[PDB]
Amino acid sequence: KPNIVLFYVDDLGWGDLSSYGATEVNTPNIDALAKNGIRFTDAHSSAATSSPSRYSLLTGEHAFRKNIRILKGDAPLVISEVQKTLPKMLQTVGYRTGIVGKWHLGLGDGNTPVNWNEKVKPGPLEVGFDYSFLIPATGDRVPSVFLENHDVVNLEKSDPLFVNYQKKIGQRPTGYENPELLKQGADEQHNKSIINGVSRIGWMQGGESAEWHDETFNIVTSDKAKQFISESSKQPFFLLFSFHDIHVPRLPNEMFRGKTNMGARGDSIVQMDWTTGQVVEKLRELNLLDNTLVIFTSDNGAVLTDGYDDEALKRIGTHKQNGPYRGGKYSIYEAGTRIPFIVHYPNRVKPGVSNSLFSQIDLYASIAELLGVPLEETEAIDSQNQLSPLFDASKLARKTLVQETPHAKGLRENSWKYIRPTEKDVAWVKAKKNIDPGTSKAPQLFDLDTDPSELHNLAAKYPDKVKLLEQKLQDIELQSIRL
Amino acid sequence: KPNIVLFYVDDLGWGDLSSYGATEVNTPNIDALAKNGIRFTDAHSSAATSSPSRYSLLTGEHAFRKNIRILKGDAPLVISEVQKTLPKMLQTVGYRTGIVGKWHLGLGDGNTPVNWNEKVKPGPLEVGFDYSFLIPATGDRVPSVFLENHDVVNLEKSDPLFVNYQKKIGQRPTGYENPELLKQGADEQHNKSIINGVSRIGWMQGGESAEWHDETFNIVTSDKAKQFISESSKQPFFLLFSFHDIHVPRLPNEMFRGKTNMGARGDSIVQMDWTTGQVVEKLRELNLLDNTLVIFTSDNGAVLTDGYDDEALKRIGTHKQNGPYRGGKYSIYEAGTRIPFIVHYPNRVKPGVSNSLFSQIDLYASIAELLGVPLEETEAIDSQNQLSPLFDASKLARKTLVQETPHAKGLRENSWKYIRPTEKDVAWVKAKKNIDPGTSKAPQLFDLDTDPSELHNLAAKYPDKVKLLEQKLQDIELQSIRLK
Ligand SMILES: O=S(=O)(O)OC[C@H]1O[C@H](O[C@H]2[C@@H](O)[C@@H](CO)O[C@@H](O[C@@H]3[C@H](O)[C@@H](OS(=O)(=O)O)[C@@H](O)O[C@@H]3COS(=O)(=O)O)[C@@H]2OS(=O)(=O)O)[C@H](O)[C@@H](O)[C@H]1O
Ligand SMILES: O=S(=O)(O)OC[C@H]1O[C@@H](O)[C@H](O)[C@@H](O)[C@H]1O
Ligand SMILES: [Ca+2]
Ligand SMILES: [Ca+2]
Ligand SMILES: [Cl-]
Ligand SMILES: [Cl-]
Ligand SMILES: [Cl-]
Secondary structure, eight states, X not given: OOEEEEEEESSOOTTSSGGGXXXXXXXXXXXXXXXXXXXXXXXXXXXXXXXXXXXXXXXXXXXXXXXXXXXXXXXXXXSOTTSOOHHHHHHTTTOEEXXXXXOOSOOBOSSSOOOTTSOOOSSGGGTTOSEEEEESSOTTBSOOBOEETTEETTOOTTSOOEEESXXXXXXXXXXXXXXXXXXXXXXXXXXXBEETTEEOBSEEXXXXXXXXXXXXXXXXXXXXXXXXXXXXXXXXXXXXXXXXXTSSSOOOOGGGTTSSSSOHHHHHHXXXXXXXXXXXXXXXXXXXXXXXXXXXXXXXXXXXXXXXXXXXXXXXXXXXXXXXXXXXXXXXXXXXXXXXXXXXXXXXXXXXXXXXXXXXXXXXXXXXXXXXXXXXXXXXXXXXXXXXXXXXXXXXXXXXXXXXXXXXXXXXXXXXXXXXOOOOOOHHHHHHXXXXXXXXXXXXXXXXXXXXXXXXXXXXXXXXXXXXXXXXXXXXXXXXXXX | OOEEEEEEESSOOTTXXXXXXXXXXXXXXXXXXXXXXXXXXXXXXXXXXXXXXXXXXXXXXXXXXXXXXXXXXXXXXXXOTXXXXXXXXXXXXXXXXXXXEEOOSOOBOSSSOOXXXXXXXXXXXXXXXXXXXXXXXXXXXXXXXXXXXXEETTOOTTSOOEEESSSOOSSOOBTTTOGGGOSSOBOGGGOSXXXXXXXXXXXXXXXXXXXXXGGGHHHHHHHHHHHHHHHGGGSOEEEEEEOOTXXXXXXXXXXXXXXXXXXXXXXXXXXXXXXXXXXXXXXXXXXXXXXXXXEEEESSOOOSOSSBOOOXXXXXXXXXXXXXXXXXXXXXXXXXXXXXXXXXXXXXXXXEEEOSBEEGGGHHXXXXXXXXXXXXXXXXXXXXXXXXXXXXXXXXXXXXXXXXXXXXXXXXXXXXXXXXOOOOOOHHHHHTTOSOOOOOSSOEEEETTTOTTOOSOOTTTOHHHHHHHHHHHHHHHHOOSOOO
């Protein structure tokens, strides 16, 4: 029973790592993991946005089965208290489970809004986690406080904490009223309550003692992960290290500012690599690294301009955050879900590069197979046993895989890519995010071997292929049991 | 005997046209040719630099056979006067042949330096062209004058013209002396004589009346091309419209400044498309567009920072000038030679998109086949007959193609790409050009189907494939006669 450490980066694109070809940023720690492990070139998150991908990561099922969308800071937990989750699965075989970082899976129960001043339940502790130290929503969503287990860290009863997303509450300055105090400019959605010089989404009243310090996320989070690892060093443990990097607002520690010529976004990649090093080296000191299944991946494709004036697009230079793939965050094109995926397990995995169609949804069933945990017919219905290609870069994995986004759905059948037509008009992606969302009123079909960036639609040349793929996409939607 | 008009752009990247996916720039006129003809996605120039590719375009053979490198402004002509060339071949079937634009193939005879004040021979007129309106070297190399046939245009005997690439000559202001006069900053190689407010490579003395005006290149070149077309409308003709766009310095006409959010480089693409349109509309106006074989392609891959402070890199935004391919100008990676290539011929070409491995070198032998011109065994020894894939997107073309750059040679065998190792160190490509030259002390091998940006070197996992690909490269280097 090896330990499992899951590095889950926020918005890390296929090309944002030097082992994936980046030249404007060096990721040495993550690169050494790829060198002594398997690097996947065709691995995918379940969706093109955070909440849905995180839901599939932990439940082994497609996010559309529960219509998961980007959650707001006070949304209720999307994972039922009895739902079968990956951490619960590992618990039944003695693993001590923990998560350090971003949650974004909801925290309340729905009936009554979240009272950030009393115990916050259900949450990570109710869906398979023993220990939890989180960032409730996202780095840019209030509350800007750490929630340990069931309690908000450093909360003073003398200064109760409240949040509101529709109107201003409290006496904190905002970005629209007080733009003078901002460290970075913000768009309309992100110009509310200011905390640590940066406005966020929504208003935050009180709880000043519970306020976090963005520039120390690297230290605070690595410190917690190292402690949890030290506490569970003599037993099997699973640690989901969920980063805030490289999600907006990008506020890296001063020791990284200027390490790249790309601005805060690039420097956040440097910080992210450093943080990863702290955890990896911690496992090395305790001689646990060779017997640890390390998985380094991301929740969705990269984005440059995501709401703050941080120079991501202006100073991009020659950097290709999505490598050769088109799209990015929010998009149905490859880059929306095609991301970095590294497996590092020296005791059982030989170094290699895998071009197998791999999905993060299959982590649940592949880890069950690793430890012999039989799965119910109703458990992680979409998660397939793909442990063999996970540990051998030469083995094949999937043939078919559905890609999700709020705007459209798509399907991969070997090198074929099909995007189902939609009438939804989503211009905010192209306008505000500088990404083609991939929608179209007409079907789309691409051969990624000759057209890797999805520039030549073949829907009209192979109309039966479109119908076949559309048919197989319907079957997967109608599926309700395993296999 | 259809008319043949060949548009040859300078440094146009695979993704610089909107019909190849560009979103930050619009090329409506050029896209119109793609919608009505074949768009090639795996077509390649012979080399990753100007002069080597141009030589291969007109001689039908690899440039390394004569060690052609980027030519200085006063270089002698690299095409022998007795050497068979594509324009000559067309001359023997009654075609009137002309060239308007960038030459960059040398002009002296090699024994004496070109005297710009006398007739310049041998030039395009001695290698198969009837008419020629030229930019001698490049927009950034002196002389900054026009050469029509054998004489410099608007040259006054009262002000003789001289060039010198080793030391300053004449009284013209320079970039290293008069920075306050420049419209754009220039690196050390481009800070010499100032002409029209932009320093160039080399020093220019005299010939003021013959100086060109960069910003009106679009009008001067399109007018010359329109005259030539208008006059040869009675006879079959071959026009090589060799663009300066989008090479440095990028000085588009006023009517295009601000059309894109990428600065001078992006606005030159706009001007480039407009100039192309002016020529296409002249063919239509004269009812020749349908009976005209129009080929639109590029001499080598794209570059952003090439010598002038023109914001090409600071304002690139989301533009992917090279599409998904790695490298660019000067590189042995795909983007060095993988370029836009469109064939517009309404009387014999149906609209399509072709993924066939296609080489510009084959244009000589494919056009010969179109006209039934038998080729000698020692002529265009690298030019293969690929007329079937040139006119039908569904037909295959090449299986093997050798790629050139001064530091390394490469080979393509279907989707496999092999880069022969080299001890050469070209640091300026990364330092100043912001492009990866593709050099490596060790062999490189890629599967472009799974690794389109050549990121995963497979040379170690397939040592026999490397050997076989390296062997195939030697055979093409030793070949001296036509194949098959
Ligand atoms: O018409 S095009 O082919 O499309 O444009 C041609 C370009 O010519 C220049 O670019 C380089 C080219 O001449 C190359 C020859 O293969 O040599 C390069 O010079 C390098 C160094 O760059 C140079 O640096 S310097 O301080 O500015 O003088 C110097 O170190 O010498 C080497 C040559 O040695 S070698 O080629 O390895 O054997 C040219 O680039 S540059 O000097 O860096 O600017 C031109 O710069 C481009 O604008 C195009 O005009
Ligand atoms: O990575 S995610 O957590 O899914 O991002 C959620 C996003 O919502 C968008 O509408 C915001 O404008 C972004 O700033 C970002 O916060
Ligand atoms: Ca995310
Ligand atoms: Ca060029
Ligand atoms: Cl208190
Ligand atoms: Cl389309
Ligand atoms: Cl701009």
